[PDB]
């Protein structure tokens, strides 16, 4: 397994898969895409790599650039299986170094590419823990789980010229180019790149469409559970926090542009161990508006239809926010005051909105019971963050002559604390799209797989692969049900599809709550 | 059929009923109860009558004191069958005269009395058109349909001393005394008087409980479709209007007390032909707060529990207000602005309430169709007037150790413009309690009676008669269903009973809308 690219010649490996169904998976763990930053051009955009003679021995898990899984990280943005089994995930990124600009591959003539921008809160994660070879061989596609500058030294900007456009986004654009101008040797199609991701890694899958440098690189998108217009998708206070890690290591010279030229020699391990604690439901180090890759906010920029006709696929796990409440008449009256204070932009005229919300999410038919409160509160954080910025992105993107789809996941692998009372909960969609049941349970996903779960993987890896093939999720190839047609989303009818437990194509998901959060509350302020 | 009372000796008559079921009905049309006002003591309280020797020939329809059925009367307060077939009703009160202080009776030892205070808008009506002999003989009770000072010279007050406590209420209290101290000769029980009425004649059935002069007279009540705390139950601007009929006949001397002493000689026929047009949904001549019979408003007076333990029975015809709309996105946006302006007490801070109402009474699942609007508007006038001042009277009267019942009528005799799209509509409960089907259709009620309707009369004249017997509607004696127990109303559960088309004892009528109108909107102002 040896191939050659314009940059040189690289080797590979091949493995035998666990399940009896699947066959010849080839792997190319660790191939590069750009020159690694070293300390001179840190806090700086990337450049192409060098060239080598002979053969490059590249088959290992490459180092993942520095993170810290014991850092009092936010517990809302991160998924469940990442939080609970943290001891298993922590034993997976052990070797870390400033040099992380590599990318894995999985080769099963012009096959589609499925670049996976791993999720998280922009603080940790890696493609090493999302080793999808089952997904690589089932649908007969090429996966690529890269690594990019994430964390402190990942997405810099300050307001001055010393920290220009966010180096992470254009960092993974450097890889979008590499995959676009070197993939013919690997058997891929440079005209069918389909970025996809989850969590807050899908927030930066919309952000790439509205920019400019993305023109000739990719053609489609997939947005699992994220959106560019939520309350933790973009950073809006770079300067206040960028001068607060410098207040514990020391660069806060009152001269504005006197922080890069002392930190740029600071070692990477001390610079990623600061308690930059963001405001509630806000982030600290994410993509920022500067002008070259984020000209104008997606609030405005999305209205003027300068984005081309790609085909976004939005989705929402039904029930997620299980870490918002985990029952009285003054306990349910206590979350719904600090919640409103924390996440409303802080205008004046609040005293009406709290009571309107408190009236709308009550069930007056049976008020008394304690399973209304602590169960509608889980329906008040699922709606304001994941459920109704999504339809706003669906409408305005469907109007401008473009196809936008939808879905709503429901069914999870049953484990501890996961009854039907406990639905997806920001996760439990990832194992199924990754094929964890179909080859036996792995380490980080402990559950009790059955033959009921394994049928879901077939359909959810046929959709997400036929998609990359042609955008419609069904045309090439066809559980408990079958053949249901994948219905679109248009402003008039708003048909979601319910890829849950029995795939019925229902309509108009939560009309009352979506309309309350989207078309009534803007008037109150 | 000749009897004697403490005032003298009176004759009677007896008739044979149309239906084969019923038998010996006796009647005493026209017996007096008080001295008729003549022109000296007009605008003045009543007094006892004289005494006569021999026998008084009293069997005719007595004159009904002056009204005017062609006077551009309000079309919301009045029932339907009274408005449509106005030509039939107008041929029924032909002979009118200042002298109207008489009362009918119907004798079928200490039998209960069922004094009926006829409805309307306090401008017209009479007991002559509600001749209930079927109701008199079926349940074996005594009816009494009196006449009282109604209209212009009926409920006077000005703010000065020239017009003291409302002469109509204490006028029908004079009859409440007469029936309480002369009924032993007629076979009635002076300790079981049960006032009942409908329309805005049931508004002045609550008003008598909260007063004082009602102590030893009656013991129960029935409130069909009315309440003392609605927007047309009491007059709150006597002076502005009492000086406006005097501006077309002439008494508006700028001296305050210079209107009684010129009008008191004016003939009754000119004084009842003035266009005193009230404000929308308000009235002009109704009971007013002065101090002796209405000490304090039922807004306050009902809170302090000075009213004794009677047993009110509230009720609401499901669907009524069919003369509120009789479909666009700016037609439904046009009623819900002037409606809010007209009927809100005119404070500042309106611009939020209109939009909140417009959001709550929409059906976002299917917005487009034209049978949402012009059908939820009929559900916006039924709720703010008849449906949710009623439950407020039920709760606060059930708390103070008293029994309060409830019901919700649904089924009507089918006629023109009366499908199941068109429910009760402020009326169609009166024929059934009056027995119009059971003896064949009368003049003023044209319909097509069937054997389906005639079973409803049995139950609705067993309830309203067992009630007067013992207050519980069921204990002595027991369609499409049977034996369903008459459930009470208490603050915790709010069980209505649905005496409609199939008597199922459901619970918590319109919790969302009742709670919206009763426990959310008071904060917005």
UniProtKB/Swiss-Prot annotation, chains A, B:
Keywords recorded for this protein, A-Z: Cell adhesion, Cell membrane, Cell projection, Disulfide bond, Glycoprotein, Membrane, Phosphoprotein, Postsynaptic cell membrane, Signal, Synapse, Transmembrane, Transmembrane helix
Coiled coil segments of this chain: none
GO biological process: cell-cell adhesion; cell-cell junction maintenance; gephyrin clustering involved in postsynaptic density assembly; inhibitory synapse assembly; insulin metabolic process; jump response; locomotory exploration behavior; modulation of chemical synaptic transmission
Extracellular compartment spans: 1-525
Disulfide partners: 65-100, 251-262, 413-447
Top-rank taxon, per record: Eukaryota
Nucleotidyltransferase found in the keyword field: no
Residues annotated as glycosylated: 57, 95, 448
UniProt subcellular location: Cell membrane; Postsynaptic cell membrane; Presynaptic cell membrane
Job of this protein: Transmembrane scaffolding protein involved in cell-cell interactions via its interactions with neurexin family members. Mediates cell-cell interactions both in neurons and in other types of cells, such as Langerhans beta cells. Plays a role in synapse function and synaptic signal transmission, especially via gamma-aminobutyric acid receptors (GABA(A) receptors). Functions by recruiting and clustering synaptic proteins. Promotes clustering of postsynaptic GABRG2 and GPHN. Promotes clustering of postsynaptic LHFPL4.
Family: Belongs to the type-B carboxylesterase/lipase family.
Name the record gives this protein: Neuroligin-2
Species, as recorded: Homo sapiens (Human)
């Amino acid at each position: 397994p040896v191939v050659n690219t314009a940059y040189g010649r690289v080797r590979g490996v091949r493995r035998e898969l666990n399940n009896e169904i699947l066959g010849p998976v080839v792997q190319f763990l660790g191939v590069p895409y750009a020159t690694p930053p070293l300390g001179a051009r840190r806090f700086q955009p990337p450049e192409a790599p060098a060239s080598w003679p002979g053969v490059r021995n590249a088959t290992t898990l490459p180092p993942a650039c520095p993170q810290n899984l014991h850092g009092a990280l936010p517990a809302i943005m991160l998924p469940v299986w990442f939080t609970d089994n943290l001891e298993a995930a922590a034993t997976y990124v052990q070797n870390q170094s400033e040099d992380c600009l590599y990318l894995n591959l999985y080769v099963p003539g012009k096959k589609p590419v499925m670049l996976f921008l791993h999720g998280g809160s922009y603080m940790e994660g890696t493609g090493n823990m999302f080793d999808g070879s089952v997904l690589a061989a089932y649908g007969n596609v090429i996966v690529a789980t890269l690594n990019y500058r994430l964390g402190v030294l990942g997405f810099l900007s300050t307001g001055d010229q010393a920290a220009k456009g966010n180096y992470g986004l254009l960092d993974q654009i450097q890889a979008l180019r590499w995959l676009s101008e070197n993939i013919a040797h690997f058997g891929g199609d440079p005209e069918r790149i389909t970025i996809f991701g989850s969590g807050a890694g899908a927030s930066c899958v919309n952000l790439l469409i509205l920019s400019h440098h993305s023109e000739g690189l990719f053609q489609k998108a997939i947005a699992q559970s994220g959106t560019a217009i939520s309350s933790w998708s973009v950073n809006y206070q770079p300067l206040k926090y960028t001068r607060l890690l410098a207040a514990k290591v020391g660069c806060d010279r009152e001269d504005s542009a006197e922080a890069v030229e002392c930190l740029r020699r600071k070692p990477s391990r001390e610079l990623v161990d600061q308690d930059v604690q963001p405001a509630r439901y806000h982030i600290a180090f994410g993509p920022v508006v500067d002008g070259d890759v984020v000209p104008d906010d997606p609030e405005i920029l999305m209205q003027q239809g300068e984005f081309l006709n790609y085909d976004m696929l939005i989705g929402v796990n039904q029930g997620e926010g299980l870490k918002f409440v985990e029952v009285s008449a003054s306990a349910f009256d206590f979350t719904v005051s600090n919640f409103v204070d924390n996440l409303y932009g802080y205008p004046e005229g609040k005293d009406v909105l709290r009571e309107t919300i408190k009236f709308m999410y009550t069930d007056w038919a049976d008020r008394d019971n304690g399973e209304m409160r602590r169960k509608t509160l889980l329906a008040l954080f699922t709606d304001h963050q994941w459920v109704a910025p999504a339809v706003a992105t669906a409408k305005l993107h469907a109007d401008y002559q473009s196809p936008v789809y939808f879905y709503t996941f429901y069914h999870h692998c049953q484990a501890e604390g996961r009854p039907e009372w406990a639905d997806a909960a920001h996760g439990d969609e990832l194992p199924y799209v990754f094929g964890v049941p179909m080859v036996g349970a792995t380490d980080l996903f402990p559950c009790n797989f059955s033959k009921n779960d394994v049928m879901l993987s077939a359909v959810v890896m046929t959709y997400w692969t036929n998609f990359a093939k042609t955008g419609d999720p069904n045309q090439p190839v066809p559980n408990r049900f079958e053949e249901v047609v994948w219905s679109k989303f248009n402003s008039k009818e708003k048909q979601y599809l319910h890829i849950g437990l029995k795939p019925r194509v229902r309509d108009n998901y939560r009309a009352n709550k979506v309309a309350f959060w989207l078309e009534l509350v803007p008037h109150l302020h």
